[PDB]
Amino acid sequence: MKTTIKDIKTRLFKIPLKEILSDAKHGDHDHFELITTTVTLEDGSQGTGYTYTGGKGGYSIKAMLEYDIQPALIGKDATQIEEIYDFMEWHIHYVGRGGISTFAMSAVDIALWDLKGKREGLPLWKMAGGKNNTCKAYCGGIDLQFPLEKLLNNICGYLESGFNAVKIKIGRENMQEDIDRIKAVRELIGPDITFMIDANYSLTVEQAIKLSKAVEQYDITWFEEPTLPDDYKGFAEIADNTAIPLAMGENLHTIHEFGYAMDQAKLGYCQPDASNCGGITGWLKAADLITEHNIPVCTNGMQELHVSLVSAFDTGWLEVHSFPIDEYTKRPLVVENFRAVASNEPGIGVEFDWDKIAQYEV
Amino acid sequence: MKTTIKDIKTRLFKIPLKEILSDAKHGDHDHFELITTTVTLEDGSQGTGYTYTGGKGGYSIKAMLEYDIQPALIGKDATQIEEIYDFMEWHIHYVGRGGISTFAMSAVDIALWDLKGKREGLPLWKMAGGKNNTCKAYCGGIDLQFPLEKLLNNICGYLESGFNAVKIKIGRENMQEDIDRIKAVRELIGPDITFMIDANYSLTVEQAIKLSKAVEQYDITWFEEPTLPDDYKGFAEIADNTAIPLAMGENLHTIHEFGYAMDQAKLGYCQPDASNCGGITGWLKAADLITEHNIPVCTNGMQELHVSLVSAFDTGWLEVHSFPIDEYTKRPLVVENFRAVASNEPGIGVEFDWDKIAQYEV
Numbered sequence: 158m159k160t161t162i163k164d165i166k167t168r169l170f171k172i173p174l175k176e177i178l179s180d181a182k183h184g185d186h187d188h189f190e191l192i193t194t195t196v197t198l199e200d201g202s203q204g205t206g207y208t209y210t211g212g213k214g215g216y217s218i219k220a221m222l223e224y225d226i227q228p229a230l231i232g233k234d235a236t237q238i239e240e241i242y243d244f245m246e247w248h249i250h251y252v253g254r255g256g257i258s259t260f261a262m263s264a265v266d267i268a269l270w271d272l273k274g275k276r277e278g279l280p281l282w283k284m285a286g287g288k289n290n291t292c293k294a295y296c297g298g299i300d301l302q303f304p305l306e307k308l309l310n311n312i313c314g315y316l317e318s319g320f321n322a323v324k325i326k327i328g329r330e331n332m333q334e335d336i337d338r339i340k341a342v343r344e345l346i347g348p349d350i351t352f353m354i355d356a357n358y359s360l361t362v363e364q365a366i367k368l369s370k371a372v373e374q375y376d377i378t379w380f381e382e383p384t385l386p387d388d389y390k391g392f393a394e395i396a397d398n399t400a401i402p403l404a405m406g407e408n409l410h411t412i413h414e415f416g417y418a419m420d421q422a423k424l425g426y427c428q429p430d431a432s433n434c435g436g437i438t439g440w441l442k443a444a445d446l447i448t449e450h451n452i453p454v455c456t457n458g459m460q461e462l463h464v465s466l467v468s469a470f471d472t473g474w475l476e477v478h479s480f481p482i483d484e485y486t487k488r489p490l491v492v493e494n495f496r497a498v499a500s501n502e503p504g505i506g507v508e509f510d511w512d513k514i515a516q517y518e519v
Numbered sequence: 520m521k522t523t524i525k526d527i528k529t530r531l532f533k534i535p536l537k538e539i540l541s542d543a544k545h546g547d548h549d550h551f552e553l554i555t556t557t558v559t560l561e562d563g564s565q566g567t568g569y570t571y572t573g574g575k576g577g578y579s580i581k582a583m584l585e586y587d588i589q590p591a592l593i594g595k596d597a598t599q600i601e602e603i604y605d606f607m608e609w610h611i612h613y614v615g616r617g618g619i620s621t622f623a624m625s626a627v628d629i630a631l632w633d634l635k636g637k638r639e640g641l642p643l644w645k646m647a648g649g650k651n652n653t654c655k656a657y658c659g660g661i662d663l664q665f666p667l668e669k670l671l672n673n674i675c676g677y678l679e680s681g682f683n684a685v686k687i688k689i690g691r692e693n694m695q696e697d698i699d700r701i702k703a704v705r706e707l708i709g710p711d712i713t714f715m716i717d718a719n720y721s722l723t724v725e726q727a728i729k730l731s732k733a734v735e736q737y738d739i740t741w742f743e744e745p746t747l748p749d750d751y752k753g754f755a756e757i758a759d760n761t762a763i764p765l766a767m768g769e770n771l772h773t774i775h776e777f778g779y780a781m782d783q784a785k786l787g788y789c790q791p792d793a794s795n796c797g798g799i800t801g802w803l804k805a806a807d808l809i810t811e812h813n814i815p816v817c818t819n820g821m822q823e824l825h826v827s828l829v830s831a832f833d834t835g836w837l838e839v840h841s842f843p844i845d846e847y848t849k850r851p852l853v854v855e856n857f858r859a860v861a862s863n864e865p866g867i868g869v870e871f872d873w874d875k876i877a878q879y880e881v
């Protein structure tokens with residue numbers, strides 16, 4: 158069959174960051190890992206999807222693909238995306254239900270949509286729902302260990318780089334420092350700029366409430382991952398006692414977790430990550446759910462892929478993440494008039510510059 | 520420091536089953552995978568823990584250990600088990616929250632308890648709580664594709680092997696066959712034998728209810744994993760409409776999932792698996808919780824390790840699983856008078872016969 162999967166090829170890349178990036182629970186990053194998956198159909202068509210980590214899991218994700226998943230996909234018909242997706246979910250279920258398994262599925266799934274897009278002459282933002290092809294964008298700096306001086310300069314760079322919204326890390330040991338930095342940033346950017354905060358589940362319910370009430374005076378748009386993402390009730394406890402809307406989702410790997418969030422976590426914003434909730438298939442499944450609850454669909458990481466998905470739903474924000482994955486693709490993020498812009502090129506709209514990253518392959 | 524971790528060594532084994540084993544969602548098994556982890560302290564002490572899969576994840580789990588976890592543990596003090604455990608949970612959190620990551624942690628954690636047991640001259644059933652050193656045992660046959668004739672013989676083997684309780688797989692396409700096999704087995708074993716059924720999350724809520732009411736007349740002790748383990752409400756829906764107590768837990772990888780189960784799933788029995796909920800540390804954390812809810816603590820798989828843990832809590836059942844891991848250890852499961860018996864040897868009570876399994880290493 159022309160669209161039968163002839164071969165799958167996965168590569169692992171270790172790409173240095175130009176600077177160390179730091180948050181309260183993931184710690185310090187010196188590089189990130191890039192797992193690419195190329196799928197070849199019998200007629201010769203080629204799709205490439207991918208996933209990333211902040212440095213851990215690369216080999217593990219790749220081992221998964223190469224020994225547990227890719228041998229099962231050869232001979233399957235790549236046009237049956239939902240089916241192949243469902244095949245994987247049960248195929249690796251004993252070692253699945255999120256974790257490494259979802260990253261692996263995501264790389265494969267995104268590959269299939271790259272094939273489908275090319276097969277149908279369609280851009281991802283069209284196949285993903287087409288409501289729009291631009292979206293709101295904010296800068297997410299992974300900047301917890303930065304001196305306040307560095308922090309303000311950095312944010313000044315964002316604003317002058319043509320963005321109009323910023324998110325900073327919180328989660329310092331001395332909560333007073335977080336309050337001080339927040340107030341510092343608000344003073345810098347003025348009243349007309351969307352400001353978010355991200356705690357990276359570093360706080361207790363008590364602490365988050367204590368912190369939230371402390372800074373709500375600086376007009377915070379949302380308060381991301383205040384406590385452990387598994388503590389859905391904790392979120393509801395936090396929300397019931399604070400005014401800043403809560404956000405979460407980057408760490409949810411499963412449509413069921415998204416169900417819990419919507420049903421119990423009292424979120425204002427939700428943040429499915431295609432790289433680790435089952436590619437574009439799983440992402441759409443999550444974004445549908447979130448929309449059925451009338452909650453804006455946003456995304457962290459992977460700006461080059463997620464611009465198509467956020468724009469397609471046209472309700473949420475796109476995080477312009479500090480891992481510069483798009484700088485190693487043939488289309489770094491496009492920003493016109495404060496909005497990120499999806500490609501009209503058929504496929505997922507991401508083509509890696511293999512020559513540039515060849516040097517970082519493992 | 521004497522108990523500083525000098526080296527960690529992980530091996531992967533592919534061990535053929537003497538026969539194909541089959542259930543409704545994991546499909547057919549021809550082998551299982553065994554991941555051993557040996558930890559060497561500076562004073563020379565050695566502990567070995569492990570994990571298993573039904574064939575998928577081996578390389579992935581091992582990649583995890585070797586590239587993401589073991590390099591972080593060298594130089595740490597092996598006597599700080601809870602600490603090292605907490606270190607891992609956040610270390611691999613972006614790629615964690617269950618999945619491959621928990622298997623990997625489990626192999627490491629169990630290694631540390633093997634060191635601790637040997638360090639303190641204590642058997643695992645003592646360190647794990649000591650309430651008893653024998654426990655109730657039932658045979659879990661992975662037998663879905665067996666002709667009824669085979670099935671009854673097989674079960675007859677169990678009963679004559681000195682067991683007094685049996686669990687069979689259900690989840691055939693024709694639900695009538697499952698009802699027929701269940702009735703068949705009950706007739707065979709008579710009224711004095713504990714009978715469980717395991718559906719391996721192959722059913723819908725409707726189907727499970729339909730099936731449960733159908734067979735409750737044959738005195739079923741529990742009804743394991745009727746539907747997707749993520750659907751905690753589905754469980755409560757099933758339980759609210761049926762009489763056979765529900766069981767679950769083998770597929771829960773996280774203390775939070777166990778919280779959900781207890782708070783929403785309305786279980787009669789709960790089944791933490793040390794091999795994939797964070798070793799003995801994580802297991803104890805789950806068994807405590809389950810006990811605080813006054814629900815019997817049981818275990819699937821890994822009879823040679825779990826006999827110490829079930830006996831220590833003295834409320835639950837031990838599944839004598841069909842992967843014969845213990846046949847490759849220097850102490851195959853001991854059964855006296857229908858009860859499984861834990862070792863009084865210090866450590867976890869499992870020593871692999873390396874010569875025997877050398878031939879299956881990858």
Ligand SMILES: [Mg+2]
Pocket residue numbers: 355356357381382407457
């Ligand atoms: Mg975050």
Ligand SMILES: [Mg+2]
Pocket residue numbers: 407430457458
């Ligand atoms: Mg993300």
Ligand SMILES: [Mg+2]
Pocket residue numbers: 717718719743744769819
């Ligand atoms: Mg089961």
Ligand SMILES: [Mg+2]
Pocket residue numbers: 769792819820
């Ligand atoms: Mg198990």
